[PDB]
């Protein structure tokens, strides 16, 4: 049983770790060898927010730039978007504005957007300074968090935060 069902979509460049964020949050599982997502899938998890039972319905698909038959239906009814980049790949961060534009074109203008810097475990390979991205999110009215699906850091916090914002909106 649940009080509210919130559809949240994962978006961001291929390879940034969307599918592993999904698997970590909903199954407590991670795969170092995960391959590009072929179709569209979702998984659920219920959490408590302000005394109420929130069933999170988290959607996932490959972060392809091309037009896709699935795009409109993918964002349809979504109340939150986790916009993910790879902290160790600067290009995926450069492409954040492109994902913001996809949201304007295909999703509700009222959608809650959280910027997620994934792979924070890759300390030695970092290309995007935390302070830089933090500043960017603030300038653009987005919530921000850095995660590691690999070691679990901030994964729970990330989903908790976005779902709580959605609930209180």
């Amino acid at each position: 049983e649940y009080d509210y069902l919130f559809k949240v979509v994962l978006i961001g460049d291929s390879g940034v770790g969307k599918s592993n964020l999904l698997s970590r949050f909903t199954r407590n599982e991670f795969n170092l060898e995960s391959k590009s997502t072929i179709g569209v899938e979702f998984a659920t998890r219920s959490i408590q927010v302000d005394g109420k039972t929130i069933k999170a319905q988290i959607w996932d698909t490959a972060g392809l730039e091309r037009y896709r038959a699935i795009t409109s239906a993918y964002y349809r009814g979504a109340v939150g978007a986790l916009l993910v980049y790879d902290i160790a790949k600067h290009l995926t961060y450069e492409n954040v504005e492109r994902w913001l534009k996809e949201l304007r074109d295909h999703a509700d203008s009222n959608i809650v957007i959280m910027l997620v810097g994934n792979k924070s475990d890759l300390r030695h390979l970092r290309a995007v300074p935390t302070d830089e991205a933090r500043a960017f999110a603030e300038k653009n009215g987005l919530s921000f968090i850095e995660t590691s699906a690999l070691d679990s850091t901030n994964v729970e916090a990330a989903f908790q935060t976005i779902l709580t914002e959605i609930y209180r909106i």
Binding site: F42, A43, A73
Partner: protein, 54 residues
Amino acid sequence: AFSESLAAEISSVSRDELMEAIQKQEEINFRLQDYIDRIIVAIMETNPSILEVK
């Protein structure tokens, strides 16, 4: 040496043919992904529960 470093960069196949092979493979990828996406959107708009990772 130079001739060794150069040799490693020369394919037995002409670059024109190599480029044609790139385009052919990209076309197929895009056609297959579209074919898949058309199936998936059909499911999304009929019974999206099929898409749940249970």
